[PDB]
Amino acid sequence: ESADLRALAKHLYDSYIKSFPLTKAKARAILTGKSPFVIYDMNSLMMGEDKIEVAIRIFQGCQFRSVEAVQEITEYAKSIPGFVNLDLNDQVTLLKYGVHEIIYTMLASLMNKDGVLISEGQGFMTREFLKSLRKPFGDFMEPKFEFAVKFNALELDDSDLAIFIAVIILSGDRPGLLNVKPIEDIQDNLLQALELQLKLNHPESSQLFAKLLQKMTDLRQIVTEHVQLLQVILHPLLQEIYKDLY
């Protein structure tokens, strides 16, 4: 069992490395100096557009990048053992209600308190420049930075995140699922793999597993806040997902 749980953890990490171009390990090395173009004002944004309405151009740009993120997450989900054996309507339902929770978890790997890496680490857009965008675009990334600073304090690595992301995807309580029991059976196995992984990898963080379970609830609140903010404000694929999260 435990040996199988370590094998499951390794399989997920290997697929995680392949499905996502910029891992947290590489992101933190770029963020700490171990090089991206810094966008900190209107002048550097225009310079960076040449090197790599303004508020609408930014929002539409990340709208396309989020759709590409959905593609990467879908590729990773299909590598989770047992996922492709689920009914295709359940695979689509799990992805539709979970991709944004995954996007914000992985986005945290690209952020610090000062800004976020963009374009596969080629750029770095500051948190305060994003806040300077006209309303309502100036508050569109702020809740994500707030979550990331606290989430990053847990100091998870890529091997932890690969299992954590799989746990979120295999949520048996998404609306419209046909066969809840096989999804819950996979998640329980993933949850045991995650608990074993955190115990081995974080010998000085005794309550890390419990804190991560609470983060999964926080992510649902971030998504709810995000779709409400988007109701006040569009890519046709995202509208398909948003129509069911409103």
Ligand SMILES: O=C(O)C(F)(F)C(F)(F)C(F)(F)C(F)(F)C(F)(F)C(F)(F)C(F)(F)F
């Ligand atoms: O290309 C990417 O993957 C990206 F850089 F992440 C982005 F999604 F395009 C972006 F984050 F929205 C971006 F970088 F901000 C931007 F390119 F859209 C922009 F804002 F710089 C511009 F003005 F080009 F749209």
Ligand SMILES: O=C(O)C(F)(F)C(F)(F)C(F)(F)C(F)(F)C(F)(F)C(F)(F)C(F)(F)F
């Ligand atoms: O680093 C980037 O290139 C990026 F665009 F910021 C992103 F990380 F890909 C991103 F997470 F997809 C995002 F665009 F920031 C976003 F998806 F979080 C969003 F802000 F667009 C959404 F609207 F989805 F929250």
Ligand SMILES: O=C(O)C(F)(F)C(F)(F)C(F)(F)C(F)(F)C(F)(F)C(F)(F)C(F)(F)F
């Ligand atoms: O609108 C539909 O009829 C649809 F096919 F269900 C869908 F909305 F496109 C969707 F499949 F849910 C989806 F949003 F595109 C999806 F995200 F689930 C996905 F299947 F396309 C992806 F693969 F991206 F997860």
